[PDB]
Design a protein around this ligand. Sequence first.
Ligand SMILES: O=c1ccc2ccc(O)cc2o1
Ligand SMILES: O=c1ccc2ccc(O)cc2o1
Ligand SMILES: [Cl-]
Ligand SMILES: [Cl-]
Ligand SMILES: [Cl-]
Ligand SMILES: [Cl-]
Ligand code: NA
Ligand code: NA
Lengths: 407, 407
Amino acid sequence: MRRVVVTGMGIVSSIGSNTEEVTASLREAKSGISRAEEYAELGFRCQVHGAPDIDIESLVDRRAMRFHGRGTAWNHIAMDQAIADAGLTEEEVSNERTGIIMGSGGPSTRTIVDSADITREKGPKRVGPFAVPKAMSSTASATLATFFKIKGINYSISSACATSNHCIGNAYEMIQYGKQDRMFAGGCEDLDWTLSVLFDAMGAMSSKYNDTPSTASRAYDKNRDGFVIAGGAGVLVLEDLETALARGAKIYGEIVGYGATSDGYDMVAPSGEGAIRCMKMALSTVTSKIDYINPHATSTPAGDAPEIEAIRQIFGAGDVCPPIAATKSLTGHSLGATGVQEAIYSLLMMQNNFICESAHIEELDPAFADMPIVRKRIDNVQLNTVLSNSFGFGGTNATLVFQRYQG
Amino acid sequence: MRRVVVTGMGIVSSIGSNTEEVTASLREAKSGISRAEEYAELGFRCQVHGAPDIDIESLVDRRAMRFHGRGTAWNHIAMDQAIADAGLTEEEVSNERTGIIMGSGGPSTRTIVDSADITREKGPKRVGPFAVPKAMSSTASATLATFFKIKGINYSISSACATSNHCIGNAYEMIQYGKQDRMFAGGCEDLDWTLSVLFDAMGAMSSKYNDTPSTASRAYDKNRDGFVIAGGAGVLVLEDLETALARGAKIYGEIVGYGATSDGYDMVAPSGEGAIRCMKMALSTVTSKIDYINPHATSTPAGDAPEIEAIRQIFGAGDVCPPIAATKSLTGHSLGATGVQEAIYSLLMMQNNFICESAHIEELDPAFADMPIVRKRIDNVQLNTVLSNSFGFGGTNATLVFQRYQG
Ligand SMILES: O=c1ccc2ccc(O)cc2o1
Ligand SMILES: O=c1ccc2ccc(O)cc2o1
Ligand SMILES: [Cl-]
Ligand SMILES: [Cl-]
Ligand SMILES: [Cl-]
Ligand SMILES: [Cl-]
Ligand code: NA
Ligand code: NA
């Protein structure tokens, strides 16, 4: 099997519109969570969200927007960023050896609802002719593959919270096995009431911190009360090592492990043992210690704990366990975008020699008192190997491990 | 690489609720297309559809239905059928070596619209707590993985019309490379006005045959005027050859080729050259002649023709080209379900030694007069190798090749 490296990154996040803004937010523990006035107007319990702040029309031209919902428009921006970061020529983007696996947890729910509404109000013709590519589950891959003239692999993986972790892992496999030499991998999610309401109705999102929105997402806090939803996108450029070296690529890291398993247990709560198997699978090909864990931890009573127990089973407790810092306390949970964004946060922390605070822990849950959850930013630390989990509804698990390239 | 065989099949289709009914429909060219009265009531141009006729409540119990939209309920039925056909024990279904890649072109658009409607009419709580797994793009994998206690791989691929072809191809790869020994692969789609209207608004569906619905889908006919939408599901059980042989499995066929490419051209029309590359990739690992082609051909002016030219480029014209019969003329286009259903139709034709008529060709398009499009059922033919294309919006291409197992 060939070695696979990350040569470019792009991101649209609740904590920044590019990698520089994201890095500053991570370093300063600047929350991306704000009040969602619209959710209050609609009668939601949860009235907080993690909204990107970015001017799409200034970055994606009108004709290029024809088939984009707002999630895939963010993904287009992230792809432009990743291409620029990697320094790719047009020929390097568009060729038979270069593919795309780009996913979202759902499609444009807003397009679907707006279309149903206008059908009933003004008639089917008034849906317009461009709604299908926005409404389909493959929207993120179809729109970008077409626009960027991708000629190799083209499809989406979805797996709820795990979506863009599996997209990256499958793209990794394609390159390892020699089927493609370069891949664009990642994902996105729109942020829209038509999606958020589904989670509010199940009671899954935070509602006890509506008056202090910035601190509503608080993984590992004793009084965590649900996740905070977000939208955004991320893209990695992946290349086989020889391809990267030969063109003088930047190497942000090497992908050195990938795990994917299934709980076969509960639709909306994890079993724990599935996560253990997933992390073990990712670690089976890794020969250095793990220096940092970017957990799944979404700030839920039932979710944060089983993952911690899984981590304890593999790594032990206390100082011998890698430092753990939940970036979702700053960013919220961007569903399809989460895996790739967390890969990017982890790679940026590696680049900049720090581990962010696990934010908004006002009172640590005593169940986790034995674990090295980061309470204050750790500076001047050399990270060489980082692990990131994403564990999604339907018992779907994905873990990725990235390593500093040193030959 | 390991060899991979199909050991069980399940299907819910517009042309039958199991493989026996489907076989009878193929043999007798019995159309599955009917009038869609609801589409007329809503003001659609197209007023035809391919609707399954199956009693879900009699086949999936109430608690098992909690997280199913109607597409994934059909997929559950197809999975039960495939498990029974393969003769699998509970331990063979649920183990770390057995996974699922099961997709849909979209999620339950009906769940999304109903939820938005009830939010506005009665409040967010009245969405209920079970809508998320129905509305997410991974619905088909999440629901079945959880219910059937799947422990290995668990995710969905989506790629519009190509969805379940890529699901099968990626599952094939997993087994080839030794990561899993058994996979459930396939997909589904609900049939609902909230999805169909998106296609009617783009003018993509047939509307000149509303008064003769049964003949509205007519691939290769001079007067074809758009596809006919359908819903349903299909599942294949895939196993590495040694696993299959050792347990006395039925072998419906061996997967011997898989192609996946990208046009990088137009969102809603094919380039043709992408399809050539896709078929060539699938054929690169095949060492016998092709005895039958199950085309993408959806009964559209702009779609049927470029595929025929691609076929002509690879295979030539006339008698030296494999017989071509478009099953969508009987079945309509079931989007996420199409690839796996067409695999099943092709394997059933192989099993039963016939090639179905390419139905509803009242006047052949003169552009295709040189091609061996099947005008009347061909009997007493031994099929050993069959090829099936699916080419989806966003320029996404997938081809599979199956072969009669003879050692
Ligand atoms: O990651 C997810 C999980 C559920 C889900 C449900 C609906 C949707 O539109 C997107 C979603 O993304
Ligand atoms: O195969 C498809 C293509 C487009 C599409 C669009 C919306 C949807 O809900 C399902 C779909 O399936
Ligand atoms: Cl979107
Ligand atoms: Cl459940
Ligand atoms: Cl469904
Ligand atoms: Cl286009
Ligand atoms: Na993570
Ligand atoms: Na086909």
